Amino acid sequence: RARRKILAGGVKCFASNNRERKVFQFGGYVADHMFYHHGDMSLNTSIIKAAQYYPGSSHLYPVFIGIGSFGSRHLGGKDAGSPRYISVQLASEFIKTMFPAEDSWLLPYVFEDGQRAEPEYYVPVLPLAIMEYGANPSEGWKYTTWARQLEDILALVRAYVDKDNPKHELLHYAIKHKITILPLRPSNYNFKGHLKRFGQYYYSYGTYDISEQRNIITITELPLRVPTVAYIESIKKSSNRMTFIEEIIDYSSSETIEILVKLKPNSLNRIVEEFKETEEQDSIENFLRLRNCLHSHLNFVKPKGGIIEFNSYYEILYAWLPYRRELYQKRLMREHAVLKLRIIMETAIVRYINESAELNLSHYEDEKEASRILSEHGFPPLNHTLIISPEFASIEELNQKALQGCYTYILSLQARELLIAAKTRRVEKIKKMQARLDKVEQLLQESPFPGASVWLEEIDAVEKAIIKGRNTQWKFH
Amino acid sequence: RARRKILAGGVKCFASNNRERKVFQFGGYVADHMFYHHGDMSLNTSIIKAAQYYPGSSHLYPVFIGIGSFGSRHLGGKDAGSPRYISVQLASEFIKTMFPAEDSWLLPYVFEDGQRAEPEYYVPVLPLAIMEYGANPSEGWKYTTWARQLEDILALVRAYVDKDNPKHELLHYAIKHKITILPLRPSNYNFKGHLKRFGQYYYSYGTYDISEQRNIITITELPLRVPTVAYIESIKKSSNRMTFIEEIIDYSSSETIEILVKLKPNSLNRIVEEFKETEEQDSIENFLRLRNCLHSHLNFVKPKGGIIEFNSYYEILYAWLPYRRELYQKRLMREHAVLKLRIIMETAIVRYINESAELNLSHYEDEKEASRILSEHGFPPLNHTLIISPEFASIEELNQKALQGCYTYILSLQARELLIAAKTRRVEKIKKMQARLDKVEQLLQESPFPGASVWLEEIDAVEKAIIKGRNTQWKFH
C-alpha cells in the first residue's frame, strides 16, 4: 500500500546522502518519483504517521528518524506540527539492517506505463506485520491490531534458524500439526500495567496510587491504546458517574504522568454495594475505565491480491518464514551466479594481457571472420555493464543475456591496463571473488535452508540498531 | 569601454547557439560574466543603443540583430520599448566576418582578480572607429563625430592590400609625406540631400519641394543627424519667425517622409529683402533650418591608456592599418607554430602503432629509467590538451610549455586506436595538416605584409554580409 511507496521513496531520496530534508520537500520527492497523486496533505499525513514515535503508537519504531514533535499520546498523534517547517530524516541504520539492500534487487516488482513501480510486498529480516499496531493512512476505515512482545518472535525465528537451539526439531514438529508449542503474548514495552487473559480474550489495566495519609489518589499508568482526552470524555459521559465524581483535574503530560484525583473518604464506603462486586477487578478500578477488551483484527496482504484472515498470530508467523526463507535462497544463488560471471571476465582480461603485445598478436579483430577465431582462442563473448554492474535481473534471465553478450569489454581498454602493475591488481582481485565464491559455495548447502548463518548475523544487526536508537537521544551517532 | 564588454558577452552567450534571447536576460548574462555593475538600466540602454538601427543613428549597422522597434529618427532612439518584453539577437553572420573568431584568441587581454577581462582594443577587418558616429553610452557627456562614406575606406584598404591595385606604391608613397592623395568624404547612405565643402568645414542640406500649381510646399529630406522634434522646436524658438509662419503641421513618419507646408504667396516677395540675400543658399532654405555645420571630434582609444586627437581622418586610418597588419602576421605565425606541434603528435602516435604490439615492445614504461629509453626511441614528451585544443596562448609561451610537456598522450589510448582501420584515419589526417602547413608556408612571405590574400577574402566576406542584411527583411536567412 502507501506504506511501501514512502519507504522506497525514502531510501531512494537518501541513497546518495542522508541529510535533513523538509517534509514538504520529501513529500513532493516521493510523489514525483512514483506519481502518487492521492493528495500532498494525505501523503504528508501518512509520512508523519509512518515517522511518528510516541508510547502506544501504531508503529513501535518509526521508519524514519523523528525530528521535532510529530505527535503525542494525549491526542493520538493528531497534534503534528506544520510539515512546511518541520523536517524528516531517513533511519539509515535500522532500514539497512532491517531491510537488506542487496535483497531489494530480487523483490517481485510490478511495471506500469513502462516504468518501475512499488513491489507487491516487502520481506524484511523480522515480520513487520506483527510488531506494529493498526493505523489509518487513509480516512474513514481504521485498522486496529495488537502487537506481540519483542521476545517471543525472536525465540521463534532463532529456533527456526540457529542449529544449536534445543527447540529446533520440536518447532519444526509443531508446524505440521499446528500445535504452536511456543508462546505468543502481546507487547509490554512502555506499559506499566498488567496483562491478564481469560478464555480467548486479553485485557489491559492501568495503575493507580491511593495514599491514606494524604487522602490523595494518584494516577500512574494510562491504558495501552486510548487517547488521554478520550479517557477524560469517557468518564464524563455517564450521568450517574457525575454523582460519584466531585473534582477531576487533568495533570497528564508528555514523558511525565502524575495526576492527582480528589475523592472524599465518605464515598468509598458505598461504592461496592451497587456495582455487583465484580470478582475480576475491584470497584476502585472498575469505576474508572481502565480495562480494554482485545479483539484482534488479524490480516495479511495477499500475494495474489486481496486480504486474508487468520485464526491466530501463529498462522501469520508460520506463513511468513517460508517467504523470507526462499529469499535467502534466491539472494545466495543469484550472487553465486553473477560472481562466476565476474570470475571469467577478470580471468579473460588477464589472459588477454598474457596474449597481448608481450606474447601474442590478434590485431585483425574482424567482425565475422575473426568471431570463430576468437572463439577458438577461448575468449568469452560476454557483454559488460551487466556483470560489472548488476541490476534488477533474476537468475534465469541473467545467464541468457550474459552468455549471448557483445564485445568491447576487450580490445577497447586503456593501453595502461595491460601493464604488469595493472595486471597485478587484476590477478590479486580474481582470487578475492574466487575466495568469496568459496564462502558462498560453503553456504546454500545446509540441510534446513540456505543462508542460515547470515540470518543470525542479520538478526544481531537488527538488535544492535534498536539498542543504539533507544540508548542515545535518537541521534544514532 | 562598455561597447567591447557587450560584444564579448554577446558572442560568448550565443557561442553554443544563436537564438532569441530577452534583453533583460541578455543584459543579466552580460553583467554576470564580466561583473559589470554600472546599472542594469544603463547596461540595457547601451545594449539598445548598440543594437539600434535607424537612419542617421550613431551605429550605421547594429552589432546585434534588431528585433522589434528599438527607436526612431524623430526622437533619436529615445523611444525604445520595454527591455523586459523585447528580445535581442546576435548578428552571427556579420560579427564572424567582421571580427575574426580565430584572431580573438590573440587579442591583448587584461586580467583582474585572477579572471579574464575585456581586451584593451578590438581590431576588426574594417576600422569601426570611422564608420560609426558618436554615441553616449553614459550620461552627461555626448560624443559627436561624422562617419566617412563606405567607398573611400574600401579603396584605401584594397590599395594597401591587393597587389594588382594601380595606386599601391603611390599609397605607400603618401604615407611617408602624409600628403593623403586618396579622397575621404562623409557618409551619404540614407541621406537624400547635398554635401558641400568650404575651407575645412562641411555642411548638409535638406530637400524641399515647391509646387506652383497647387501652392503647397512639400518637405522631402530631413538633415543628417538632427531629431525631427528638434527641428520643429528650432523653427518655433525665434520670435520674429513666428510672424513669417502661418501654419506648420508635422507629417513626418517612419520610412515615409511627406510633409505639407502652407505658405501664402504674399509672403514670398519680401523674404529676400531683409535676410541679406545669402550667396551660399537661397532664403527659402535659409528661413528653415536645413544647414548643419560640421566640427568633427576625432578621437581614438590610446593603447597605453587615454585619449588622442588627430588633425584629419587620414591620421586615424593611417595608424589603424599597422595594428591590423601586425595581427595578420601574428595569427599566421601562431597557427603555423601550433600546426607543426600537431604534426609531430600525430606522426608519433602513428609511429607508436608501428612500434606497437604488431612489431616492437616497450611495455616497461618506467618513470625515470625509461624516460631516457623513450628519449632514444624518439617519442616526443609533449603534453596533450594544449596542442589538440589551443587556448589564449601566444607564440613565445606556446613552445615553452609544449616541449616541456608530459606523457599520457601515448600508452594510454584505446586499444582499438592501434588497429589498421584506426591507423588509416590517422595517416590520412597527418597529410591534411601537412598540406595545410604548405598553404601557410606559402603565405607569411609576401613582400608587403603576411596574410595579404586572406585580407582580401575577409573584405569580400564583410561585403557579402552587408549586402545580404540589406536585401532581406533583416532576417539573414
Author numbering:
A (entry chain B), B (entry chain A): 716 to 1192
Describing publication, verbatim:
We first performed the cryo-EM reconstruction of the full-length apo-AsfvTop2 without DNA or nucleotide. Furthermore, these primary conformational states are each sub-classified into two conformers, a and b, exhibiting local differences. The distribution of the three primary co-existing apo-conformers is approximately 1:4:2. Even though such differences are modest energetically, they do suggest that the closed state II is the most stable state, followed by the C-gate open state III and then the open state I. These thermodynamic properties are reflected in their structural properties described in the following sections. The changes in the Ia/IIa pair are mainly in the closing of the DNA-gate via the WHD subdomain. Conformers Ia/Ib were aligned globally with two apo-yeast Top2 structures. The results from the preceding section suggest that, even though the global conformation of apo-IIa is very similar to that of EDI-1, binding of DNA/inhibitor still induces small subdomain reorientations, yet coupled with substantial catalytically relevant conformational changes locally.
